[PDB]
Amino acid sequence: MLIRRLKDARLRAGISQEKLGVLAGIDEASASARMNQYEKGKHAPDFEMANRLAKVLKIPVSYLYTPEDDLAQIILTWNELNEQERKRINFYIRKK
Amino acid sequence: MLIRRLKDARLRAGISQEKLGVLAGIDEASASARMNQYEKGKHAPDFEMANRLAKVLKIPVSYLYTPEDDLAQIILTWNELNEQERKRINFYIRKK
């Protein structure tokens, strides 16, 4: 998982490390330390934990694993497109 | 990592479990077993190994972590768009 993706998504949500960890199911006594460890690259979450974090942060989980900034932005944006916008992109992509 | 993403990307490349493992730097004696284990969900690769697999398979690594089929397809397709198509999508996404 890319640490800067996790940090960015948390900053965008506007929530603290402790609050993110807590909503992700971590004992609040350890919540902030655990999140800080992930964000500093000391430990990597497993895919199951990353999915929990992504759910709390309201992002597609694969955003956290996307090294390419342009693709990351597309992922983050797709996430919030209305159904007509998604259709247009889906159609544009069809057969390509 | 999603096992079906790994398997699909390997089938699309048209290469065997052994050849994928080998090009990914695994001792050929263990290559196919190791790949089969990943593809059957017995072990999960770490992000560094997933990046190696994705490089061999010529896909954005985050494809392997994308649960949503529509987003997966967008990722796989973006991967192969010409520079003008990418520009159009980038522009469409701007400010959204």
Residue numbers in the entry:
A (entry chain A), B (entry chain B): 1 to 96
Study authors write:
The protein crystallised in two space groups: a monoclinic form (P21) and a cubic form (F4132). The calculated Matthews coefficients were 2.38 Å3 Da− 1 (one monomer in the asymmetric unit) and 2.01 Å3 Da− 1 (two monomers in the asymmetric unit) for the cubic and monoclinic structures, respectively. A similar analysis of the monoclinic form of C.Csp231I reveals the same major features at the dimer interface, with an equivalent pair of interchain H-bonds. The buried surface area is reduced by ca 200 Å due to a small outward rotation of the final C-terminal helices relative to each other (residues 88–96), which may in part be due to the observed differences in crystal packing contacts in this region. The analysis of B-factors in the cubic crystal form of C.Csp231I reveals that the extended C-terminal region of the protein, comprising helices 6 and 7, is significantly more mobile than the rest of the structure. This is not so apparent in the monoclinic form, where crystal packing forces stabilise this region and the B-factors are more evenly distributed throughout the entire structure.
They form the basis of a highly cooperative, concentration-dependent genetic switch involved in both activation and repression of R–M genes. Here we present biophysical, biochemical, and high-resolution structural analysis of a novel class of controller proteins, exemplified by C.Csp231I. In contrast to all previously solved C-protein structures, each protein subunit has two extra helices at the C-terminus, which play a large part in maintaining the dimer interface.
